[PDB]
């Protein structure tokens with residue numbers, strides 16, 4: 001449920017565009033909220049996506065205050081993340097990050113993805129643009145309810161699983177260590193031939209052990225790729241050593 005009347009919401013500033021629109025605002029003139037308004041060209045699937053997200057609780061997953069369904073265009077009321085999306089945050093603060101901080105960002109995404117893996121929830125579009133930065137550089141996964149991030153099963157047969165998200169996490173790991181760089185920059189049809197031949201280059205900030213995990217995520221077979229539960233302890237071992 002969690003229905004919010006449009007009078008309870010106050011629109012302050014437009015922060016995002018495309019997709020639909022992201023606005024900075026206030027709910028009941030008290031809480032800083034991120035209002036995600038739908039674009040003209042589905043209303044039912046948009047409301048369904050929020051209901052799934054409201055039933056999944058993890059410190060590394062974005063939380064919703066409620067939904068505004070009364071007036072069209074409809075909108076979802078999210079908790080405001082101070083530092084925006086991960087993809088933009090990495091590019092703006094480029095050259096200021098340490099390898100320890102970048103691995104910590106990857107561990108935050110892996111924590112939320114391990115919870116979704118156990119709950120049998122598949123994130124069909126896992127990328128740095130779909131991750132948010134909050135207080136004290138904490139990373140939260142968003143929109144859990146684009147051939148560059150897609151696995152061979154996805155771009156050829158549309159087979160979605162938790163192991164296909166592992167591939168997307170591998171590309172996400174590349175985006176973090178390269179400090180917000182665009183993967184395969186190169187059309188979607190051209191990227192298919194490069195992946196099928198048998199990958200993304202090793203970023204300067206990423207070590208041999210970090211890049212080894214990225215290739216484990218980039219395995220041709222889904223069964224060869226490690227599970228998010230295994231990846232979490234694997235990434236934690238690198239942080240200690």
Ligand SMILES: CCC(O)(CC)c1cc(OCCN2CCOCC2)c2cc(-c3n[nH]c4ccsc34)[nH]c2c1
Nearest residue numbers: 015016017022034078079080081082083084085142
């Ligand atoms: C105003 C402060 C700041 O510019 C960071 C310096 C910012 C910007 C934000 O939007 C970035 C634009 N993207 C464009 C791509 O689609 C997502 C939004 C966002 C978006 C959020 C946000 N917080 N919570 C949620 C949930 C979905 S988006 C979002 N917080 C933001 C903060």
